[PDB]
Design a protein around this ligand. Structure first.
Ligand code: ADP
Ligand code: ADP
Lengths: 338, 191, 100, 166, 111, 192, 56, 56, 45
């Protein structure tokens, strides 16, 4: 049960540029584990679960924050998507199936599985199906779901394992692109077309960081979210954006950095790898235009290194390899040292 | 035929005329000769917007070669009566009545385009009948002239004597000239 | 019947599983006492009514007010008790911390 | 209290057969309708469960069946129909089942009127075929005969707009 | 009740319920009485073409057309003790009385 | 009357007017005698498009015989104020006011059809009354003449002296001649 | 295609896309992303476990 | 392939098949390669009332 | 079925406090209790 500050330090190692969000998750997760750790419950008072609501852009690190916490405090971690459960047909089967997936990593142990951290994404899409939200709120508030015991050909209703979802932490991540306009209307001037309106749609979205930080329940209901669902998500964490410079840091600063992964692959082969700073901006610029955030970094680097990876094993006498911005463009070939 | 524009939000899509879509942004269009019917419509928009939000500013685009004086006073009194600050932007031109409404806007929120033409003159009227009735109507129009000059001096900041000499005859003004005169605060050259 | 502002204040302290008692117990186990002034409870109820969130919104309001202290309280030492007042709700003043 | 008396009076020495009266909690959202149901399970001796009407749908459709309500009550009752028959049930969001207006019913509304038609026999008391667990109705013989005659029902919902009607 | 081949319960299940009271005695069941409540619910929604199959509505009526007059229904022998060797019991409903009942809301408008 | 059209979108089929449908694609139609009423309608269309996407260009189709200067000048100031570039295309003809708006378009985006006729003349007006009033109005219209010629020279690139002599009387310019004069940049003969 | 199709304009200066040069399976599957695969029915976790993608 | 406990097939037999090819040697078996053809045919589908369960 | 609602509403408050009361030998209900203007009479032994 590490302190929130200690938890933030671990997140800082793998996630950068979202220090504010780490603070919200560190304190929230600390309380959830503290309640589980304080299982004695000597005093008559009953502690209540607190569910977080992550609002950030695509590829901003919402998913990475989920598993990173589980890695620190070993617990089963599962991920789900709202689009998968929007069918609205026999929703009870799929919601309990999420627990079945969690139990697979928890050795089918109810106690260990209850401590798992569940994560959901793309919650904005269902907001407008209204009916699917009715089923989702029950899962967050707490419900007992029966699951078969470690699979098997068949088992009776008695052997079915029942896991209480009240003790499981649920993180309903999402990306509300249109919510920024609603907040500006309520907080800033309600003019967007006239001469005096602000139409500086440069796509920088620097204001979006502090604008989304002012999120209140009023803006969520306008988006289509029902008030009951909002009430079950008291904690709110907001990611602003990943800047071009921030992407350069993510390429090397993280522990399991993308550059380090490829560098190690070349090192064992027998040739070292050097990533010039000039090449980093080229990769970061491409990711920004693509709008994939950090996700595109892996694809851009792999394609650039695909040609050398094919010929480098066959080739010999290459003492060292260097990369520059020209290589990223594709016009040039990676420099080889002999 | 006014075109229809679609507004898209999470709740759904709504179709509005170009004029109604801009009304949601607190933008009122003043066009043509001022009269009781058109003025009543503008007043209804001010009250409607006041109810929605009494704090947000209201914008008024003025392009009109003047009109009935009585209809104009209704708009002027309405703007001052309501709490929201009514911004005034001169598009194309602003004649006697248009200029009075233009300068009547909230201090610091009066604008005009660079090529706009602002003209101010004294009231125009006429009456046919007995000499006794003429004196009654003649006294009425003179009181309106003095009353209008007093209000224009207040907003513009110029002396009453200076406003009387300048408004005796038609005095065409340009956007930069209006700024120094006091009719407007600044010019909106570019964004 | 629909809840009123006065009722919201009662819900914060009168219930056996009151929201305030939950956070108090969370701090008591750590060894730091917690106290909420009546001035703060009234402001909390006004925010819920102002936002129309209702009784459910009370959890969110308390979370934001104690977000800073809950993060630093475990790492901090020599904190015998914490006092909250209306000044904390609006955000103008940080929650008062008592040292032993 | 009356419910316990009926169960206590299960012997029925007198010829008279005690009837069942159901409750309909109508109130605005956030007024503690759900809380009242949760605060009874703590002290309630008989099995109690909670469900949602929105999920329920007419039989023969992909949404759900009303018989599944008994499955939840059986989980707490250890799948013992004897004691489950003396249980209590709570149905939330019953307002969404109401028909909206001027509907010819040609569309064969499932989420609405269809759910009400199925609950009718359930509330007054009828034998229901309940699958063992996590199963759907089919020609298979995996069914459990459960009687709802002595099972109380408390349908609670926020009838938004009813004030205007009144 | 729903049309055959759907998730809903089949019409033949009614005979199974009657076989539980008679200790699964076909002879005593063939001479039994039956009551079908809420019969008004299974009704075409004033749409003779029936664009979409009304398995819960019109479909139920079609299945019951031959049952009321008489049909050799097939049901499990004894509550499905074991699925192998079902040997479905043959029950004739030619002599089984049926008493349907329901509240036809709106019929007054038609009359 | 105006024929309705159907636009396919993710939600489903949608009905749009022929003019409204083109407005969705940043196309504005300037047709008929330039007057205060139609000018405010064009201005509203411009401001609305600016909010939707200030980066994307706007296409203004000019087919009119001219009109009031005050009304036409409200469109010129609107075009220069907004950030997006306003492309001007001449269809059929572009008279005195239509030509000022045509040349006022964004540099490099002004176009004209091969058979279009661009006519430019000096401002015309009149006043009746006392000599003192006539002097006031005579000075005003002369200032407007210099103002319009000054702006016309800026966009076309010709000297103010040349514009003054050329616009002293009605001057008709064909689509190729307009390119040399500077009123437009290219001719859209055929789609490529 | 529904995600990466720019669309056809109506104006004189817009770019018209005829059915001849509309699109093809080649150069379209290369831009595959995890979101489109999820709509097909594949589990998101399954896609994440397969970083390498060979498109023919 | 179908869900475990059904008449169709079991996913676990894929590993067993690989052993038969490698003569049940755990060492070399771990170095084998698997090719699951027709992967798109197991795409997630919505529930069907007529079908008892969606094994695939 | 409407009859049950009318009777339950009339005896709602009575049944709530009836167990706590002492030596209540008989209870009487009259028309005055149906409309609500009056309260049911309680006889003590
Ligand atoms: N700061 C970071 N350091 C390292 N990897 C990162 C960082 N931020 C993002 N990533 C990588 O990029 C991914 C971004 O997408 P993800 O977190 O799944 O969110 P989303 O589903 O919204 O795209 C992360 O999961 C991780 O693989
Ligand atoms: N008097 C009260 N005391 C405590 N909590 C209350 C009270 N009234 C309402 N609540 C809150 O209401 C919620 C339970 O009812 P709710 O879910 O709003 O009902 P419904 O789903 O019918 O709208 C919980 O957040 C509960 O704490």
């Amino acid at each position: 049960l590490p302190t929130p500050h200690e938890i933030r330090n671990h997140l800082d190692d793998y996630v950068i540029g979202q220090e504010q969000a780490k603070k919200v998750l560190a304190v929230a997760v600390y309380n959830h584990y503290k309640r589980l750790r304080n299982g004695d419950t000597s005093n008559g008072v009953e502690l209540g679960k607190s569910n977080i609501l992550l609002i950030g852009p695509t590829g901003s690190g919402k998913t990475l924050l989920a598993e990173t916490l589980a890695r620190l405090l070993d617990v089963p971690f599962t991920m789900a998507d709202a689009t998968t459960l929007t069918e609205a047909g026999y929703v009870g089967e799929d919601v309990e199936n999420i627990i079945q997936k969690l139990l697979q990593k928890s050795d089918y142990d109810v106690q260990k599985a209850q401590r798992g951290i569940v994560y959901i994404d793309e919650i904005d899409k269902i907001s407008r199906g209204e009916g699917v939200q009715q089923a989702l709120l029950k899962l967050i508030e707490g419900t007992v779901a029966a699951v078969p015991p470690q699979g098997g050909r068949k088992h009776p209703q008695q052997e079915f394992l029942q896991v209480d979802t009240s003790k499981i932490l649920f993180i309903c991540g999402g990306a509300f692109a249109g919510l920024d306009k609603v907040i500006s209307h309520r907080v800033e001037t309600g003019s967007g077309i006239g001469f005096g309106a602000t139409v500086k749609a440069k796509s920088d979205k620097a204001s979006e960081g502090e604008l989304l930080a002012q999120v209140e329940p009023e803006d969520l209901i306008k988006f289509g979210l029902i008030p009951e669902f909002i009430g079950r998500l008291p904690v709110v964490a907001t990611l602003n954006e990943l800047s071009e410079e921030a992407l350069i840091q993510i390429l090397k600063e993280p522990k399991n950095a993308l550059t380090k992964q490829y560098q190690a692959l070349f090192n064992l082969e027998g040739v070292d790898l050097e990533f010039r700073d000039e090449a980093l901006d080229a990769i970061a610029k491409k990711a920004m235009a693509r709008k994939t955030g950090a996700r595109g970094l892996r694809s851009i680097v792999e394609a650039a290194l695909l040609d050398t990876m094919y010929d480098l094993p066959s080739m010999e006498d290459v003492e060292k390899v260097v990369i520059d911005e020209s290589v990223i463009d594709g016009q040039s070939e990676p420099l080889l040292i002999y | 035929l006014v075109p229809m524009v679609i507004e898209q939000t999470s709740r759904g899509e709504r179709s509005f005329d170009i004029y109604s879509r801009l009304l949601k942004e607190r933008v009122i269009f003043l066009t043509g000769q001022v009269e009781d019917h058109m003025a009543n419509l503008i007043v209804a928009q001010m009250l409607f917007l006041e109810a929605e939000n009494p704090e947000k500013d209201i914008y008024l685009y003025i392009n009109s070669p003047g009109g009935v004086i009585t209809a104009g006073m209704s708009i002027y009194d309405t703007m001052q009566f309501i709490k929201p600050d009514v911004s005034t932007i001169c598009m194309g031109q602003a004649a006697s009545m248009g200029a009075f409404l233009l300068t009547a806007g909230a201090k610091g929120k009066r604008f005009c385009l660079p090529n706009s033409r602002v003209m101010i003159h004294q009231p125009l009227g006429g009456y046919q009948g007995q000499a006794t009735d003429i004196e009654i109507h003649a006294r009425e129009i003179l009181k309106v002239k003095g009353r209008m000059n007093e209000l224009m001096a207040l907003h513009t900041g110029q002396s009453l004597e200076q406003i009387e000499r300048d408004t005796e005859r038609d005095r065409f003004l340009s956007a930069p000239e209006a700024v120094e005169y006091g009719l407007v605060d600044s010019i909106l050259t570019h964004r | 019947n629909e809840l009123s502002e006065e009722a919201l204040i009662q819900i914060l302290k009168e219930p056996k599983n009151a929201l305030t008692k939950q956070y108090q117990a969370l701090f008591n186990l750590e060894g730091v006492d917690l106290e909420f002034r009546d001035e703060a409870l009234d402001a909390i109820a006004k925010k819920a009514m102002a936002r129309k969130t209702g009784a459910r919104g009370l959890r969110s309001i308390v979370e934001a007010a104690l977000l800073d202290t809950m993060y630093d309280l475990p790492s901090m030492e020599d904190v015998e008790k914490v006092v909250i007042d209306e000044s904390v709700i609006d955000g103008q003043s940080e929650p008062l911390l008592i040292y032993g | 209290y009356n419910h316990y008396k009926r169960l206590r009076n299960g012997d029925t020495s007198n010829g008279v057969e005690l009837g069942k009266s159901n409750i309909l909690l109508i109130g605005p959202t956030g007024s503690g309708k759900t809380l009242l149901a949760e605060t009874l399970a703590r002290l309630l001796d008989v099995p109690f469960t909670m469900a949602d009407a929105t999920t329920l749908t007419e039989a023969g459709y992909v949404g759900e069946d009303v018989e599944n309500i008994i499955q939840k009550l059986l989980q707490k009752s250890d799948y013992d129909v004897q004691k489950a028959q003396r249980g209590i049930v709570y149905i939330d969001e019953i307002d969404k089942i109401s028909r909206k207006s001027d509907n010819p019913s040609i569309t064969r509304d499932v989420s609405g009127e269809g759910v009400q038609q199925a609950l009718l026999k359930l509330i007054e008391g009828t034998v229901a075929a309940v699958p063992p667990q996590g199963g759907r109705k089919h020609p298979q013989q995996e069914f459990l005969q459960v009687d709802t005659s002595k099972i109380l029902f408390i349908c609670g919902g926020a009838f938004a707009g009813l004030d205007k009607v009144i």
